[PDB]
Design a protein around this ligand. Structure first.
Ligand SMILES: Nc1ncnc2c1ncn2[C@H]1C[C@H](O)[C@@H](COP(=O)(O)OP(=O)(O)OP(=O)(O)O)O1
Length: 320
């Protein structure tokens, strides 16, 4: 009478119908639900996400050590959303944003809404009023940790002191997430690990996607400062199989290196060969050293585009 596989499908099906698609999924599964996304500005990461970008209408958490590249990703997403004629908001509670760097990543700063809330309640509230207006594509909340409650900001006593920031962060998410769905606005919460920073407790359960951004190498190329190599881990992903990993280089002054990506992604995926030290493509000499090679692809843009193309084919191409 029992047939495991059939029995398992009928179960999973009900799991998803009861809790939403993605509630349960085989890891090796290959998803064919092309959702609307905002390219992360990181091809590898886009593929690692399984849907080629951050899903629209969801809460995304990008936590990690300082300098690890979080903000760069967030901003890159913001640019990608604007390019697609999307409106982006930035709830700043750290006062660290460098608009000049943001322009380099490609963001249209002049059209970017910016707010600097008085208290955490205000911040989330403001961001919430924005979201449910339907005009936004993406909204960014800089520093989960800086969402300090009003009662703490205003001189309040050491009594009645409670994990209010968590509650604040919990209550706030409860109502915004639904609004985000209706509006289809991606919500990135930058969490800078120094509960995952008190309020990160709730976010963990509300986030549809969670990215563990981490600094792993100091791009040297040769013996000198250029940038840093980041490593993101999709620890949570309610819209594709989770736990995938991506890596990319972020050069100083510049954002995520496209060419860097390509050379990387081209290699593992065969198209480009590293005979050992030297890099080559379709028998074309590229250069000794990821950098000489990187440079190559920046100069000879005719290559690189056919490569990005070859890679965009073997992986994520037009669907349905
Ligand atoms: N103002 C800037 N000028 C040049 N390079 C920058 C600047 N800001 C960021 N970068 C580049 C080089 C850094 O190694 C890399 C990481 O910075 P950021 O992208 O700000 O890291 P982060 O997102 O992990 O830290 P955090 O989110 O806690 O502020 O980004």
């Amino acid at each position: 009478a029992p047939d495991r596989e059939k029995a398992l499908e009928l179960a999973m099906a009900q799991i998803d119908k009861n809790f939403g698609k993605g509630s349960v999924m085989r890891l090796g599964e290959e998803v064919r639900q092309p959702i609307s996304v905002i390219p992360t500005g990181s091809i590898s990461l886009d593929v690692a996400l399984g849907i080629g970008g951050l899903p629209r209408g969801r809460v995304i958490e990008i936590y990690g050590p300082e300098s690890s590249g979080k903000t760069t990703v967030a901003l890159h997403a913001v640019a990608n959303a604007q390019a697609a004629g999307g409106i982006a908001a930035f709830i700043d509670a750290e006062h660290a944003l460098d608009p000049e760097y943001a322009k380099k990543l490609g963001v249209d700063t002049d059209s970017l809404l910016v707010s600097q809330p008085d208290t955490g309640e205000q911040a989330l509230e403001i961001a919430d009023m924005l979201v449910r207006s339907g005009a936004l594509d993406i909204i960014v909340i800089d520093s989960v940790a800086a969402l300090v409650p009003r009662a703490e900001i205003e001189g309040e006593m050491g009594d009645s002191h409670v994990g209010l920031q968590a509650r604040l962060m919990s209550q706030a998410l409860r109502k915004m997430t639904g609004a985000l769905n209706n509006s289809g606005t991606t919500a990135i919460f930058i969490n800078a690990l120094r509960e995952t920073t008190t309020g990160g407790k709730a976010l963990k359960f509300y986030a549809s996607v969670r990215l563990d951004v981490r600094r792993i190498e100091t791009l040297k190329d040769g013996t000198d400062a250029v940038g840093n190599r980041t490593r993101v881990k999709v620890v949570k992903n309610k819209v594709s199989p989770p736990f995938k990993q991506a890596e990319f280089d972020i050069l100083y002054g510049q954002g995520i290196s496209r060419e860097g990506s390509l050379i990387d992604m081209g290699v593992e995926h065969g198209f480009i060969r590293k005979s050992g030290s030297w890099f080559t493509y379709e028998g074309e000499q590229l250069g000794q050293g990821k950098e000489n090679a990187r440079k190559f692809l920046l100069e000879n843009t005719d290559v690189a585009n056919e490569i990005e193309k070859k890679i965009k084919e073997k992986l994520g191409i037009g669907a349905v």
